[PDB]
Design an enzyme around this catalytic site. Structure first.
Site, PDB file in Angstrom:
ATOM      1  N   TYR A  71       0.831  -1.194   0.000  1.00  0.00           N
ATOM      2  CA  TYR A  71       0.000   0.000   0.000  1.00  0.00           C
ATOM      3  C   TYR A  71       0.870   1.250   0.000  1.00  0.00           C
ATOM      4  O   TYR A  71       1.819   1.357   0.778  1.00  0.00           O
ATOM      5  CB  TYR A  71      -0.941   0.003   1.215  1.00  0.00           C
ATOM      6  CG  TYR A  71      -2.040  -1.038   1.146  1.00  0.00           C
ATOM      7  CD1 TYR A  71      -3.155  -0.848   0.331  1.00  0.00           C
ATOM      8  CD2 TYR A  71      -1.902  -2.269   1.799  1.00  0.00           C
ATOM      9  CE1 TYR A  71      -4.091  -1.862   0.148  1.00  0.00           C
ATOM     10  CE2 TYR A  71      -2.827  -3.287   1.622  1.00  0.00           C
ATOM     11  CZ  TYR A  71      -3.911  -3.085   0.789  1.00  0.00           C
ATOM     12  OH  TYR A  71      -4.755  -4.135   0.514  1.00  0.00           O
ATOM     13  N   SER A  72       0.575   2.171  -0.914  1.00  0.00           N
ATOM     14  CA  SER A  72       1.273   3.448  -0.960  1.00  0.00           C
ATOM     15  C   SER A  72       1.057   4.185   0.351  1.00  0.00           C
ATOM     16  O   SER A  72      -0.074   4.311   0.817  1.00  0.00           O
ATOM     17  CB  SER A  72       0.759   4.316  -2.116  1.00  0.00           C
ATOM     18  OG  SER A  72       0.880   3.664  -3.364  1.00  0.00           O
ATOM     19  N   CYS A 253       0.458   7.108 -10.929  1.00  0.00           N
ATOM     20  CA  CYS A 253       0.075   6.103  -9.950  1.00  0.00           C
ATOM     21  C   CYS A 253      -1.421   5.838  -9.939  1.00  0.00           C
ATOM     22  O   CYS A 253      -2.230   6.766  -9.992  1.00  0.00           O
ATOM     23  CB  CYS A 253       0.541   6.517  -8.553  1.00  0.00           C
ATOM     24  SG  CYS A 253       0.381   5.229  -7.294  1.00  0.00           S
ATOM     25  N   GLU A 293       4.105   3.840 -10.837  1.00  0.00           N
ATOM     26  CA  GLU A 293       3.637   2.790  -9.947  1.00  0.00           C
ATOM     27  C   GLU A 293       2.156   2.518 -10.212  1.00  0.00           C
ATOM     28  O   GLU A 293       1.282   3.158  -9.632  1.00  0.00           O
ATOM     29  CB  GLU A 293       3.828   3.211  -8.493  1.00  0.00           C
ATOM     30  CG  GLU A 293       3.428   2.156  -7.479  1.00  0.00           C
ATOM     31  CD  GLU A 293       3.311   2.724  -6.082  1.00  0.00           C
ATOM     32  OE1 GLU A 293       4.224   3.461  -5.662  1.00  0.00           O
ATOM     33  OE2 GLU A 293       2.289   2.472  -5.416  1.00  0.00           O
ATOM     34  N   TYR A 295      -0.838  -0.695 -10.701  1.00  0.00           N
ATOM     35  CA  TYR A 295      -1.051  -1.990 -10.054  1.00  0.00           C
ATOM     36  C   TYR A 295      -2.424  -2.589 -10.342  1.00  0.00           C
ATOM     37  O   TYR A 295      -2.668  -3.733  -9.906  1.00  0.00           O
ATOM     38  CB  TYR A 295      -0.840  -1.870  -8.535  1.00  0.00           C
ATOM     39  CG  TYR A 295      -1.484  -0.656  -7.893  1.00  0.00           C
ATOM     40  CD1 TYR A 295      -2.813  -0.689  -7.460  1.00  0.00           C
ATOM     41  CD2 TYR A 295      -0.758   0.514  -7.696  1.00  0.00           C
ATOM     42  CE1 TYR A 295      -3.401   0.412  -6.840  1.00  0.00           C
ATOM     43  CE2 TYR A 295      -1.332   1.619  -7.083  1.00  0.00           C
ATOM     44  CZ  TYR A 295      -2.651   1.563  -6.651  1.00  0.00           C
ATOM     45  OH  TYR A 295      -3.199   2.650  -6.013  1.00  0.00           O
TER      46      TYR A 295
HETATM   47  C1  LIG Z   1       2.986  -0.907  -4.980  1.00  0.00           C
HETATM   48  C2  LIG Z   1       1.499  -1.112  -4.749  1.00  0.00           C
HETATM   49  C3  LIG Z   1       0.817  -0.173  -4.122  1.00  0.00           C
HETATM   50  C4  LIG Z   1      -0.556  -0.301  -3.879  1.00  0.00           C
HETATM   51  N1  LIG Z   1      -1.197   0.678  -3.258  1.00  0.00           N
HETATM   52  C5  LIG Z   1      -2.477   0.583  -2.968  1.00  0.00           C
HETATM   53  C6  LIG Z   1      -3.196   1.710  -2.272  1.00  0.00           C
HETATM   54  O1  LIG Z   1      -2.670   2.753  -1.890  1.00  0.00           O
HETATM   55  N2  LIG Z   1      -4.548   1.511  -2.030  1.00  0.00           N
HETATM   56  C7  LIG Z   1      -5.240   0.377  -2.416  1.00  0.00           C
HETATM   57  O2  LIG Z   1      -6.450   0.273  -2.194  1.00  0.00           O
HETATM   58  N3  LIG Z   1      -4.540  -0.598  -3.082  1.00  0.00           N
HETATM   59  C8  LIG Z   1      -3.227  -0.557  -3.352  1.00  0.00           C
HETATM   60  N4  LIG Z   1      -2.624  -1.553  -4.055  1.00  0.00           N
HETATM   61  C9  LIG Z   1      -3.239  -2.612  -4.248  1.00  0.00           C
HETATM   62  C10 LIG Z   1      -3.234  -3.435  -2.969  1.00  0.00           C
HETATM   63  O3  LIG Z   1      -1.946  -3.937  -2.705  1.00  0.00           O
HETATM   64  C11 LIG Z   1      -4.019  -4.760  -3.006  1.00  0.00           C
HETATM   65  O4  LIG Z   1      -3.755  -5.418  -4.288  1.00  0.00           O
HETATM   66  C12 LIG Z   1      -5.537  -4.474  -3.127  1.00  0.00           C
HETATM   67  O5  LIG Z   1      -5.849  -3.702  -1.968  1.00  0.00           O
HETATM   68  C13 LIG Z   1      -6.386  -5.660  -3.172  1.00  0.00           C
HETATM   69  O6  LIG Z   1      -5.928  -6.596  -2.157  1.00  0.00           O
HETATM   70  P1  LIG Z   1      -6.991  -7.533  -1.427  1.00  0.00           P
HETATM   71  O7  LIG Z   1      -6.265  -8.263  -0.433  1.00  0.00           O
HETATM   72  O8  LIG Z   1      -8.080  -6.639  -1.047  1.00  0.00           O
HETATM   73  O9  LIG Z   1      -7.459  -8.500  -2.626  1.00  0.00           O
HETATM   74  P2  LIG Z   1      -7.185 -10.312  -3.173  1.00  0.00           P
HETATM   75  O10 LIG Z   1      -8.025 -10.800  -2.039  1.00  0.00           O
HETATM   76  O11 LIG Z   1      -5.721 -10.491  -3.150  1.00  0.00           O
HETATM   77  O12 LIG Z   1      -7.916 -10.126  -4.419  1.00  0.00           O
HETATM   78  C14 LIG Z   1      -7.135  -9.773  -5.501  1.00  0.00           C
HETATM   79  C15 LIG Z   1      -7.128 -10.881  -6.481  1.00  0.00           C
HETATM   80  O13 LIG Z   1      -8.469 -11.165  -6.988  1.00  0.00           O
HETATM   81  C16 LIG Z   1      -8.463 -10.905  -8.401  1.00  0.00           C
HETATM   82  N5  LIG Z   1      -9.211  -9.664  -8.869  1.00  0.00           N
HETATM   83  C17 LIG Z   1      -9.065  -8.343  -8.457  1.00  0.00           C
HETATM   84  N6  LIG Z   1      -9.839  -7.477  -9.096  1.00  0.00           N
HETATM   85  C18 LIG Z   1     -10.572  -8.249 -10.024  1.00  0.00           C
HETATM   86  C19 LIG Z   1     -11.599  -7.916 -11.036  1.00  0.00           C
HETATM   87  N7  LIG Z   1     -12.105  -6.686 -11.337  1.00  0.00           N
HETATM   88  N8  LIG Z   1     -12.093  -8.930 -11.769  1.00  0.00           N
HETATM   89  C20 LIG Z   1     -11.622 -10.176 -11.529  1.00  0.00           C
HETATM   90  N9  LIG Z   1     -10.695 -10.619 -10.642  1.00  0.00           N
HETATM   91  C21 LIG Z   1     -10.190  -9.583  -9.900  1.00  0.00           C
HETATM   92  C22 LIG Z   1      -7.000 -11.178  -8.818  1.00  0.00           C
HETATM   93  O14 LIG Z   1      -6.708 -12.598  -8.879  1.00  0.00           O
HETATM   94  C23 LIG Z   1      -6.253 -10.443  -7.684  1.00  0.00           C
HETATM   95  O15 LIG Z   1      -4.964 -11.038  -7.537  1.00  0.00           O
HETATM   96  C24 LIG Z   1      -1.256  -1.463  -4.299  1.00  0.00           C
HETATM   97  C25 LIG Z   1      -0.503  -2.459  -4.960  1.00  0.00           C
HETATM   98  C26 LIG Z   1       0.824  -2.314  -5.171  1.00  0.00           C
HETATM   99  C27 LIG Z   1       1.523  -3.459  -5.893  1.00  0.00           C
END
Ligand SMILES: Cc1cc2nc3c(=O)[nH]c(=O)nc-3n(C[C@H](O)[C@H](O)[C@H](O)COP(=O)(O)OP(=O)(O)OC[C@H]3O[C@@H](n4cnc5c(N)ncnc54)[C@H](O)[C@@H]3O)c2cc1C
Length: 295
Positions: A71-72, A253, A293, A295
């Protein structure tokens, strides 16, 4: 100088939620929360443009423990209260379609974080990243191209540049260049930190320009919904003429997908002066002045 990996997933910092605030107003789409964590107890220091890891509780569908999500950092090095005791995040709850096998699917780490209570203990790692760093030059130009939660690194830059308490705390960084945020969200209620962003622009009308692309409220010239790439196309010449300055840095970003439209717009501008943008851009990357950045 740059702090990196003071805490790692094998032994993360246990922070405590101080606050968890709604950033999306009534009438907006989705849930994005501003979450502030207590850093006292340990030695997690960080700077602007960096990220941290959060490890959610629980196991995945395979029974294996959940991994960190990145998370940023949404706060400056000093934290929101300029005490150097906290760190903040800007977290959207991931939720989506039936094709996932269930119904409506909620993301693990993001639901966990957006619903977390003050007082709760969180596993935190980092800081991470040397790709979205702000130049120490107070006379640099800073173009910021953000969608949704990609506002988070931008907030750390702008707060450091323009907050009264930040300027007082940072004698060596008194920003006097120009910065331009182009921010893209679906609705006006979805303009995260809208009030503070507009107060900065009112306070520094010559050092900060704020441009919105709001897709449910504005149409681009071709009749479609307004996105950040349409705004970059609209100002392509201006943005290109700033980018030609040796001291200009551009930061992109947000969720992946806007870069292709940004490049086509800037490519058409640069071509007017016999310059191929993709090649100029590769040199800007190597120079450390093109920051991405998504994602
Ligand atoms: C460097 C970086 C910075 C980030 N900064 C932020 C930030 O500031 N704020 C923020 O909210 N997030 C940010 N993200 C994203 C964050 O890390 C997580 O990926 C995001 O919050 C979702 O994680 P989760 O655990 O909620 O989802 P998971 O439970 O891990 O669900 C995600 C998975 O489900 C699937 N999926 C996701 N969207 C869809 C869709 N529309 N249709 C179908 N399948 C899908 C994919 O398989 C994905 O891998 C960042 C990512 C990176 C890499």
């Amino acid at each position: 100088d740059v702090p990196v990996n003071l805490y790692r997933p094998n032994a993360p910092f246990i922070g405590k939620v101080i606050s968890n605030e709604p950033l999306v107003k009534e009438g907006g789409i989705g849930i994005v929360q501003h979450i502030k964590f207590d850093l006292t107890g340990g030695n997690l220091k960080y700077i602007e443009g960096q990220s941290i890891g959060i490890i959610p509780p629980g196991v995945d569908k395979n029974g294996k423990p959940e991994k960190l999500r990145l998370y940023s950092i949404a706060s400056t090095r000093h934290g929101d209260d300029v005490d150097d005791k906290t760190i903040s995040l800007c977290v959207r709850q991931l939720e989506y379609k039936h094709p996932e096998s269930g119904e409506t699917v909620y993301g693990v780490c993001s639901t966990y974080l957006t619903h977390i209570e003050p007082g709760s203990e969180v596993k935190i790692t980092g800081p991470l990243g040397k790709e979205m760093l702000l130049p120490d030059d107070p006379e640099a130009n800073v173009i910021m191209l953000a969608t949704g939660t990609g506002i988070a690194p931008m907030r750390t830059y702008l707060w450091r540049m323009f907050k009264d308490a930040e300027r007082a705390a940072n004698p060596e960084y008194q920003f006097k260049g120009f910065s331009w945020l182009v921010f893209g969200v679906p609705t006006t209620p979805n303009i995260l930190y809208k009030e503070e962003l507009e107060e900065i622009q009112q306070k520094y009308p010559d050092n900060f320009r704020l441009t919105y692309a709001i897709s449910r409220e504005q149409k681009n010239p071709q009749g479609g919904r307004m996105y950040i790439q349409d705004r970059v196309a609209e100002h392509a010449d201006q943005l290109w003429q700033l980018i030609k300055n040796q001291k200009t840095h551009t930061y992109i970003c947000g969720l992946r997908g806007m870069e292709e439209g940004i490049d086509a717009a800037l490519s058409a501008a640069a071509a007017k002066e016999g310059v191929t943008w993709s090649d100029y851009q590769k040199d800007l990357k190597k120079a450390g002045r093109w920051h991405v950045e998504t994602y």
